[PDB]
Amino acid sequence: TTLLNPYFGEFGGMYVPQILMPALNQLEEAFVSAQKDPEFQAQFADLLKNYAGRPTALTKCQNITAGTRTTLYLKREDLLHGGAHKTNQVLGQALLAKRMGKSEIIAETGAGQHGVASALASALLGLKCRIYMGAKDVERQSPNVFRMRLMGAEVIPVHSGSATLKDACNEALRDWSGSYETAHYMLGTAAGPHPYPTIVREFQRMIGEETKAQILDKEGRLPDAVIACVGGGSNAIGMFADFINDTSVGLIGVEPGGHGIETGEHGAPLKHGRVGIYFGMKAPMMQTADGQIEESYSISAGLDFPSVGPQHAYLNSIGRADYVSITDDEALEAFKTLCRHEGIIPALESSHALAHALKMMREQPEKEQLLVVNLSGRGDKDIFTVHDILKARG
Amino acid sequence: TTLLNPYFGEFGGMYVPQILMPALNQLEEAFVSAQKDPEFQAQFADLLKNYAGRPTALTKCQNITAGTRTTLYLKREDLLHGGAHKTNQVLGQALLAKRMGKSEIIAETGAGQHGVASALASALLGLKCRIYMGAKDVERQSPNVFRMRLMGAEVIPVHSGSATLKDACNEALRDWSGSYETAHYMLGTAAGPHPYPTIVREFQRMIGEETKAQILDKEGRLPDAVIACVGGGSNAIGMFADFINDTSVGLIGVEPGGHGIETGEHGAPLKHGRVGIYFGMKAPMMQTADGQIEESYSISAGLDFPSVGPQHAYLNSIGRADYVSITDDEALEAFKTLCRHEGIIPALESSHALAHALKMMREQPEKEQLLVVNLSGRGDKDIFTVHDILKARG
Amino acid sequence: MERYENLFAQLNDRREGAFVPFVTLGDPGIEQSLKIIDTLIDAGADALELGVPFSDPLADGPTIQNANLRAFAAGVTPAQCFEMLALIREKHPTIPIGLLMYANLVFNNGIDAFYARCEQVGVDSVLVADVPVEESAPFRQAALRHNIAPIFICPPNADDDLLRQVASYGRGYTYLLSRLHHLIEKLKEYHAAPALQGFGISSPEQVSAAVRAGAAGAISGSAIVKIIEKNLASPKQMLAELRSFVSAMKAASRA
Amino acid sequence: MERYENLFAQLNDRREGAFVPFVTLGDPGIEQSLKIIDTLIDAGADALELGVPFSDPLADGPTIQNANLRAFAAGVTPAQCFEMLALIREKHPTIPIGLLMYANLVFNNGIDAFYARCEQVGVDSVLVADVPVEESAPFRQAALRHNIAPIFICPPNADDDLLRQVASYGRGYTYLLSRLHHLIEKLKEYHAAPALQGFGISSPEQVSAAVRAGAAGAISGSAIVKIIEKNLASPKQMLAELRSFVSAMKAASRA
Numbered sequence A, B: 001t002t003l004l005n006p007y008f009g010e011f012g013g014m015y016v017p018q019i020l021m022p023a024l025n026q027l028e029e030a031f032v033s034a035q036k037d038p039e040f041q042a043q044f045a046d047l048l049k050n051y052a053g054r055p056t057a058l059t060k061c062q063n064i065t066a067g068t069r070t071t072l073y074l075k076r077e078d079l080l081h082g083g084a085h086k087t088n089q090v091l092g093q094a095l096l097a098k099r100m101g102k103s104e105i106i107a108e109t110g111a112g113q114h115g116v117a118s119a120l121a122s123a124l125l126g127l128k129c130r131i132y133m134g135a136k137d138v139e140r141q142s143p144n145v146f147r148m149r150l151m152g153a154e155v156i157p158v159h160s161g162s163a164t165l166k167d168a169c170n171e172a173l174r175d176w177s178g179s180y181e182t183a184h185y186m187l188g189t190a191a192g193p194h195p196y197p198t199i200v201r202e203f204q205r206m207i208g209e210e211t212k213a214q215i216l217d218k219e220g221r222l223p224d225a226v227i228a229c230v231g232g233g234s235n236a237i238g239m240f241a242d243f244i245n246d247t248s249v250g251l252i253g254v255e256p257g258g259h260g261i262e263t264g265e266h267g268a269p270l271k272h273g274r275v276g277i278y279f280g281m282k283a284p285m286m287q288t289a290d291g292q293i294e295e296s297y298s299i300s301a302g303l304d305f306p307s308v309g310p311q312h313a314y315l316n317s318i319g320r321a322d323y324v325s326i327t328d329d330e331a332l333e334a335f336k337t338l339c340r341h342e343g344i345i346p347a348l349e350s351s352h353a354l355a356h357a358l359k360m361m362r363e364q365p366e367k368e369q370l371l372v373v374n375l376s377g378r379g380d381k382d383i384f385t386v387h388d389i390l391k392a393r394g
Numbered sequence C, D: 001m002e003r004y005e006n007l008f009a010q011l012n013d014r015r016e017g018a019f020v021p022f023v024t025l026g027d028p029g030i031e032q033s034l035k036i037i038d039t040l041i042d043a044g045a046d047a048l049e050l051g052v053p054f055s056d057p058l059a060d061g062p063t064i065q066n067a068n069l070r071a072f073a074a075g076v077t078p079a080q081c082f083e084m085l086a087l088i089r090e091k092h093p094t095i096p097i098g099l100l101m102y103a104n105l106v107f108n109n110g111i112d113a114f115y116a117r118c119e120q121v122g123v124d125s126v127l128v129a130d131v132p133v134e135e136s137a138p139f140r141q142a143a144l145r146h147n148i149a150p151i152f153i154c155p156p157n158a159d160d161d162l163l164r165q166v167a168s169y170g171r172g173y174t175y176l177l178s179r180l181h182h183l184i185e186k187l188k189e190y191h192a193a194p195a196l197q198g199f200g201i202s203s204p205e206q207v208s209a210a211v212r213a214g215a216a217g218a219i220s221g222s223a224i225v226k227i228i229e230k231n232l233a234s235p236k237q238m239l240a241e242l243r244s245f246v247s248a249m250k251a252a253s254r255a
């Protein structure tokens, strides 16, 4: 029994060991309660505005669309404190943890971006944050590891198993299985077992709500489409949610195509994987023929995830949202284009969404269309990645 | 003859070779005209808001002041597009350049931060930006050099003279002496010859105006003091300007003390240098006994400047603003304190202002005082600097 | 199911508890794993709990995670595991054989087809570690249609509602997480499948305590696998050490 | 001032233009610089324009910037420059000697004191490169009280107002930036100090053209300094090359 439906059509659910069900049920109830509590809402709003910097700007990019009938706006989550949309929901989850009487946060991170977000909200709200990280990742992520420790989070190197993210997640959940009365597991995307896909969406939906008010103010109508990159699905569902019942508005999710779908080195399970059960949910995933979870790939670490949130699988299945893929090369070109023409250095994750809008524009230059791309983050973090690739390509 | 007074008491003026006076006079007139033009103002406001992200938040930092009677707010210029307050005024200057019918921008940069700011405004507004940089700096500034070129600016390595900043400035002014009809020299701080100290201040004064409205909204009164770091003086004069006639409000400028004033390795000319004439202005500067300009120093490149804006020298002389210094070690401790207690990684420049507020608080913990620190920028850029120092100190 | 029912009736007639080793199929190799399993049986295992290596075993402890890696290094796949299962049943016709699975390997080619294959090779029960009772309907239905006992974990934080569901839906045995007298009493009150205590059982005294608490037996996994882990270079010593440990744990279960 | 007035009266009586070399005091060393200056005089310089190395010479061209660096490498200071100036006047009593200064070295120990020191050593004029007429009041007043000619640059972008001020405030010579017939005519109309064309003068034909345009002479700096720059390893060759170049440029100025 749950208060909310754990499924979006056949996708979602709570595929966790029995011992974690009470933690999930407790979280769902605290979240339902929090959503009806004006005080919680006022506190979350105050932090979003006065600490994180919301509302974020909606920037019209005229230079990039010159000569075409496309009008493009970028929702500026790259201007949010921390440099990415992740900040929104970790602040909400940290408030839920406190509502449940918890003073500790458990997270795990690969690239280190969720780790940084978890650590900053925890520093701000007086929570002892411990982040599990595969030893292999700790080694390859010095900058973010340092940021996490500067902010007081305990970064726990995991050497068990293969010493990668799956090993960190494992240890994190085990920890949580024994400490959930005093610790909250802060999941970093709109995936995993219910209630997380729902919570993350609701804690990121201000992206879409603001975009709606801003576009109505500036253009006097809704967008023909909102476009967002999709790793686990949080920034995209955050942008999409408020427009779901506005059926004239297209919702386009962009998965990473990596070196190309045909090469198998990509992170596009929604359109090119197969339904499976893992990470506590039933969802499309990249898997071998006999059911092992495949390794995903993208030039962008933030989109290097082998599955996708269930609500996206569902919106896709009923045809309400369409999902496409963008390769490393297309993302890199979009990255360079935005720097040069708008003076904005976008995250490589976000460059996948921008790349797809650039393609919609360039393929049909005389098509009149009002598009909004969710610029999920800034790309200062990607400067060396891009530099070395370009240097390598002479 | 000029439209505005070139001096602030005995400080300021236009100490440039005769050939540059027409360029200065032209700029002063365009600026006076622009200030009376509602269209210019609307355009500058639109860019500040929809592209740069203004207004920036005013964040109350409760954790850091716990146990004392100090209430501290941080004006969040670190949330401005680009990560620092520099963005405000380069957007205004780029609009002035266009008002004068110019399509090119000339800048020079050492650390590379002004370079990045100039390049992004130029990319946005369709201006061909060329940035002179001492060859020694180009070598030691790969990240920012790459950012500048990603944004389309031509970064010109200077090998003339000693191949440092002074050599880049020299070449930049020479260039400007011959190209001013079509090129605008974008000065990056509130210093240099008139009209720049005035223009930069007016194009950064929204920092102080917003702070005033935000503090009156949240506290119902003005701050007991606003505190800001001082390199050339732009973010501090931007914070101070709107409060100058509010005589109850203290204005405290913080110069870098480097390894300590007594060691001579610092960047605190205002309080420890001597009046001189250089960079087109009469102002306090670090100089040898026989008049050569001394080399300044700070762990923070952005505050490593051997002089200070004339309006600061003036406010100091009449006692309206007080200036102090903060050492590298005090700035580093403030940097760590903010990361750990508020989850905000501040620029090392800004950490000097924060360090001084922390000292006002800690030295007199029972003194009731409402302080605002101008958090001029974010410190992602300083992570390796801080890391290596800490690693070096075991 | 029949094999578990038969085993527990016999053990009960002997006032004896069951000792059930857990090992990962394929660890450290297919041949060595089959020899390991035959040694556990000869040494006294009453039943077996066998893991099929999965890439993302969210609930496997450190020792078990390392067993999965060794099996993957040997190239073990679910198909090879089923071939091993067939051969193990072909050698031991009465010992109950239970699988410890992760949902995706059961769901992958169709839930019903998975339980059909278990029936075909002679497996008796399946515990899907990441399927709580709330999501168990398709799994337990498919298991029953193929005469496979669906196994549920009764954790320490179980409430009355969970006890009743577990008693009602499970067959073969109830997996009683040690991390209990009360949990055991209610399970019997609700007529649950005999309970086997699992988690951290590594010494003979824990096996006698489990039986004394009312459990029908005990499962030991990490302690067995560590023996494999420590003797990878001496296969002979590995089996000898395994025989000694299992024999000791099994004696602890006798009246 | 008297020396310039006397020089220009004599040159005019000979229908001749002035050739004025510019070098940086101390480049490449104090001794070599004094020998360089004596060679320029012996070879025909009518006057000298001498730079005092400054750390931040915003208006010095590339060749000159390198001369400052060589002088600084030799440890040249303003005090050593004044000692050199005294000695140069002590050897050549009539040649006009003009300094090219940056504001801070004049302002450093007091504007009046700086012009007093110039008078003491026998300097005749001072051009402060970064002081436009608008900021010149204290400098030109101090110069006149000490009988030093205040020199102003008349740039290419000069308007009528600038011409009148320059004609009125300057003494000795007017520094006419070549980057002119009209600028020269107005300067004479306003009774400005005789004009010397400066910037890029490197060949004899430019010296004759300057005089033909109405200028009273020409200044050559980079061309002279490059000769120093290219022969740093052969002091003898340096002086020989300097003698040849100055002698040629000076001949170009004769009727």
Ligand SMILES: O=P(O)(O)OC[C@@H](O)[C@@H](O)c1c[nH]c2ccccc12
Pocket (backbone or CB within 6 Å): A017, C022, C049, C051, C059, C060, C061, C064, C100, C129, C198, C199, C200, C201, C219, C220, C221, C222, C223
């Ligand atoms: O290793 P232990 O502490 O002896 O406990 C057995 C347990 O590991 C084994 O039965 C097992 C392996 N994987 C699992 C996944 C979920 C529940 C139980 C298991």
Ligand SMILES: O=P(O)(O)OC[C@@H](O)[C@@H](O)c1c[nH]c2ccccc12
Pocket (backbone or CB within 6 Å): B017, D022, D049, D051, D059, D060, D061, D064, D100, D129, D198, D199, D200, D201, D219, D220, D221, D222, D223
């Ligand atoms: O080097 P040129 O092109 O021959 O021009 C002489 C000029 O350099 C010299 O007079 C000079 C040296 N420094 C200056 C500063 C300002 C004006 C003029 C100067």
Ligand SMILES: *Cc1c(COP(=O)(O)O)cnc(C)c1O
Pocket (backbone or CB within 6 Å): A084, A085, A086, A113, A188, A189, A190, A229, A230, A231, A232, A233, A234, A235, A236, A302, A303, A347, A349, A350, A376, A377, A378
């Ligand atoms: C983490 C990240 C993403 C990917 O995660 P979603 O949950 O799919 O949003 C996208 N953009 C940025 C900038 C990120 O940091």
Ligand SMILES: *Cc1c(COP(=O)(O)O)cnc(C)c1O
Pocket (backbone or CB within 6 Å): B084, B085, B086, B113, B188, B189, B190, B229, B230, B231, B232, B233, B234, B235, B236, B302, B303, B347, B349, B350, B376, B377, B378
């Ligand atoms: C450039 C910089 C400064 C120093 O310059 P001011 O003109 O004195 O403001 C201060 N803070 C940051 C973050 C800077 O980038």
